[model samples]
Target chain A: MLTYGAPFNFPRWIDEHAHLLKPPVGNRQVWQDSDFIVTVVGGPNHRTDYHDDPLEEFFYQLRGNAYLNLWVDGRRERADLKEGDIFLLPPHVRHSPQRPEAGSACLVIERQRPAGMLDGFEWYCDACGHLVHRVEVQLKSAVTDLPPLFESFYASEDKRRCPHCGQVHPGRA
Target chain B: MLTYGAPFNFPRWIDEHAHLLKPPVGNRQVWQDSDFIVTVVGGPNHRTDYHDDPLEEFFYQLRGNAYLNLWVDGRRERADLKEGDIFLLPPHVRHSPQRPEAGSACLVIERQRPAGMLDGFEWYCDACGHLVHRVEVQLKSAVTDLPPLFESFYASEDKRRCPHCGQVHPGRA
Candidate 1:
């Protein structure tokens, strides 16, 4: 088993794990235990889905800037986090984090999910503000496990095209 | 009620909460939720007691160097963590962190304790390696709740002096 907890420099870790910050997989769990999970996540993630979970998520920006596209109540909103900034997102908040630059990264800390708690990956129509697709699952691995589900949603034109506005969601191609 | 979760700059936060990082209470919980707790701790602490807990603690050195005095397998050990270094301590390890400099600080991240988990604060004989005193309690607030307990331990000469070696622990005066 990979050693979960040890001592190291954060900047040095980013240098060593530079390759893992590329496409498809832009994040790596630094340490995960029974109670909490910490991950170093890279930018340029083309995900449009808003994640809805029961636990609060903490974000600390390591490099560059990013936009947290949020859905508050019924309208779409955005919050910008610059370098060295920290953000604590409340539970059940619909957040779609956007990372524009490839080298940009942040540290995300969250609680380990309980056995029955389901994480909702939802896509809302950008044009009509309608729910397009929602996938609720127990997120075990975001890198390997989540990509296939995202693929299935993007592959289907019926799923991507908004039934309300007839506008298609421009997914990461 | 204090607004627990929000967005802010980490460096800016250190500047704003500089007063809280002084002598008596040298730490402040930056953000705490149901899942995890994040605190910014300042140094020059004169604590000799080792902490025995069931959660892994993540330490990120923000300022000067520090020594983590540990007791592993009945032998005294030490680990050095410099500025920008990060260490994740495993569960149930006895650790006594020492910060020599007045301006030294670090960011500590740990899981929020579940009910019924007792944290052990113990002191060992400096000369003979005997367990001198141990206080097990459910920690609600480390700054407010812990200081009195430490004071009570130091106030009693019988508790400070080890029974095995007849050596009195030179605690912080």
Candidate 2:
């Protein structure tokens, strides 16, 4: 059996690449495969910019509360989640995660199928006129399918206009 | 992430030494663990014994019917389990598993912590009147503080006797 923490030995899948990212908002650890991913979101004051991924994702709350802003097609909606709440988001659904005024934490599990085939890959940061890098290619089997190392990233298309800023300049070019 | 049967990759934990076992009474494979077990019991059977173990277990029927023979403190009782039926077995509870006369199949999940510290220790089997070898043990660090494995045996100097031959024997000596 796999162990997460020493002296506790929590069941965890070890990631090959650096899947743990400590951003200014919080700490996010990812476990991904060709079709899906499982992410552990921890710490207070955590938030992610508006982004869209091709795979379907589900969020389950273990502690705290959060507001999920989801944009489907062109409609924007908000969802408030507390402990024990679970929500599902389909592919290409633009969604932004944020800690409410009270702050919150959650566990996000994403399922992808047919190996690395996502609908779209783009992100538009509303606060900053910055366009996030987009990668829209399939992941290599050796990098994504190996055991003990659980990090995987898909390829992307060309740079486009930043939807958040309506700027013409390519962000990652 | 781990993928089974192709493209869908998911997070799953399995014991290293733990392997699937196929009993003569069932058609599906059985996955065993020290704390819990998942098995698909197919077809009808009778007089299956529940060895001495102290923990609560839940059985959820995924497909067909099942007959549960519950013998608590030498008193025998029975319960018929159908699809979506759930039952609980308390610690040190003398019970047996059986299929109905009409015949059916089910998915059984048993949960409990492991007993004994050393591996491969021989424990006397009350049913066979011989020393039974301990093949494997699955340990989880998360359940360490719950309770000691066999605390009931210490409180009461009681033992279990074979239902067929009425031969009295220590629970675990």
Candidate 3:
């Protein structure tokens, strides 16, 4: 179990690893094996693609609301979630998440296998109708300390257009 | 760490061992071991009474708010708690907790060493001017099926009265 204080101060670790980052279209901030993430998302946004890795994702709405759109077997369904609601999405699901007009705030908890694996960029391109690799894009931009691109507009811009359908995407709001 | 969706579900064990006959005094349910208790308190109501125990008690407010009042070394202090809040109380620290008027809920996670030991009832008698070993009183009435005593009556009937101090000793609120 996760202990809260002293010798194993979990809140400190939570604070240290938690961050707001922008991921290209459908990507998420990759975490190392030793690192877990607990982030608060406070606005409308989308993670455009899906992952193949065996990481488990849990989302708890701390405040506001959001819509989780999942694509399974070529069919899409939506689950509306609000404060105190929790949902879990296992790995290998072709899913995309967006906070609707109100822009929900959520706590995302992620655990990864192996240690120190920082490769974070991966996405399924609706435009190209395929999974795209973009770790290089993230690495090239990591040199600047002015916040990661995944945490700002650039990541959104990259994933804003569907590679296959060439359809313009909408913001979370 | 306790993984989500662990193989064995403890809720079953809790149900099997739960003393429903002695229905708890609040909207709280518990899964307990010899040393610790994982209590889930929902709905409204607040404040549990000051009781002497040989273990350390900790509370984790997973959702909503709670106010913890502690009587330590002849001094009383109030702790304001909200979602994600956590705190601990040492053994024998007279303590009580209060939820806001708007209603609040929380999880009381307690840990004790040597396990399973609880302080049994030792009634205080205001009229006798001393501690009473045996006091004849109806412990549970028809209202036992209702929510916790605190939820039903913001407070409970003082089960013990301090004879030495002429004070009505409070049971948990």
Best by TM-score: 1
* Per-residue lDDT of model 3, residues A1-173, tens digit only: 11222122323433443333222221133222223343455554555533332445556565567766655565555666566565555554444567653334565655434454443444544445454433323122222422353345344755655566665444222
Find the candidate with the highest DockQ and give its number: 1
RMSD of each: 2.7, 16.7, 13.0
- On TM-score, the stronger of 2 and 3 is 3
Error of 3 at A39 (Å): 2.2
lDDT of 2 by residue, B22-74 (tens): 23324342322322243446554553334433443345453456756654434
Evaluate every candidate with DockQ and list the scores.
Answer: 0.46, 0.03, 0.03
lDDT of 3 by residue, B1-173 (tens): 21322122223433443343122334443322222334555435543434554545555565566666654445556666666665555555545556553323454544333334544323343354355332222222213422343332324233444545666645443
Which 10-residue span in candidate 2 chain B carries the lowest summed lDDT? Answer: B2-11
Q: In candidate 2, how many Å is residue A10 off?
A: 7.1
Tell the DockQ for candidate 3.
Answer: 0.03
Interface RMSD of each: 3.9, 15.5, 11.3
Ranking by lDDT: 1, 3, 2
- TM-score to true structure, per model: 0.90, 0.35, 0.39
